[PDB]
């Protein structure tokens, strides 16, 4: 290429969007924004493919341009806007509030939230830096730079912030015995307690996470998101509690539901 790419093919799109193979040649290329395009839902897929509120992309444009959709309390008219993890989407016309939270199988589950939960959000802080005449700044996972934070907040901690002010309400420290969720890799979408973190200087440090049913797994620091203090989460969880079931248990639950509901 001679410059940045502007298109995206459906088969080269991320698989968690669950796009078809014969609808088109092109997938929605997400605009640049607070989330990576590999790790986001564009608003067209959420409004059209998930919620079924629109049948075509023209109807998505027609809904967004009438100023009904808010992301983190801000009206967005870009239909390919990158919406990511812990993300609050408010539709005030229908009176609906959703959070984008990862599903157990690695996809973005649409999790309807009670409206007073839609006032805050959780952010994983990416870096700390002191600049411009001794003022400290946080940078979080969704690129919200917050100046003058609490001095006890370090990197890999999480913060609960109010969406109307953008200012920190209260934070969770990254430590063992805390509740977290996986945002990347093979174990994506699983919720469990941090057992220990092993250090590998000059490389990736590995975290071990134990499930509520005694299932242990591991990831990297780049794929951990602390969501609770201790065991109680600071957010509402999806219909599955983040427990990965094997295919045998999924089959057994499916046959049980078939037997119960006929």
């Amino acid at each position: 290429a001679r410059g940045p790419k502007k298109h995206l093919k459906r088969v080269a799109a991320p698989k968690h969007w669950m796009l078809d193979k014969l609808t088109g040649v092109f997938a929605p290329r997400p605009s640049t924004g607070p989330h990576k395009l590999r790790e986001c839902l564009p608003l067209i897929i959420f409004l059209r493919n998930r919620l079924k509120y629109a049948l075509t992309g023209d109807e998505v444009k027609k809904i967004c341009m009438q100023r009904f959709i808010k992301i983190d309390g801000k009206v967005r008219t870009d239909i390919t806007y990158p919406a990511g993890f812990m993300d609050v989407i408010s539709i005030d016309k229908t009176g609906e509030n959703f959070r984008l939270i990862y599903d157990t199988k690695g996809r973005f589950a649409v999790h309807r939230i009670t409206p007073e939960e839609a006032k805050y959000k959780l952010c994983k802080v990416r870096k700390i830096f002191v600049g411009t005449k001794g003022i400290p700044h946080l940078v979080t996972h969704d690129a919200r730079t917050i100046r003058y934070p609490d001095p006890l907040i370090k990197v890999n901690d999480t913060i609960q912030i109010d969406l109307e002010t953008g200012k920190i309400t209260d934070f969770i420290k990254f430590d063992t015995g805390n509740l977290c969720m996986v945002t990347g890799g093979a174990n994506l979408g699983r919720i469990g307690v941090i057992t220990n973190r092993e250090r590998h200087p000059g490389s990736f440090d590995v975290v071990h996470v134990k499930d509520a049913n005694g299932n242990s797994f591991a990831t990297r620091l780049s794929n951990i998101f602390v969501i609770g203090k201790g065991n109680k989460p600071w957010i509402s969880l999806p219909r599955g509690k983040g427990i990965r079931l094997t295919i045998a248990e999924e089959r057994d639950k499916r046959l049980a539901a078939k037997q119960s509901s006929g």
């Binding site: 100046r147 003058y148 609490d150 001095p151």
Partner: peptide, 30 residues
């Protein structure tokens, strides 16, 4: 906005120096 936020963090930093002073106190004293 800068004046009030800087004054609030100035209160926070004077606080953080106060508890830093006391933590230094039981660390040195013991």
């Amino acid at each position: 906005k800068n004046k009030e936020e800087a004054a609030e963090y100035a209160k926070l930093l004077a606080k953080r120096m106060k508890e830093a002073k006391e933590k230094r106190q039981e660390q040195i004293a013991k």
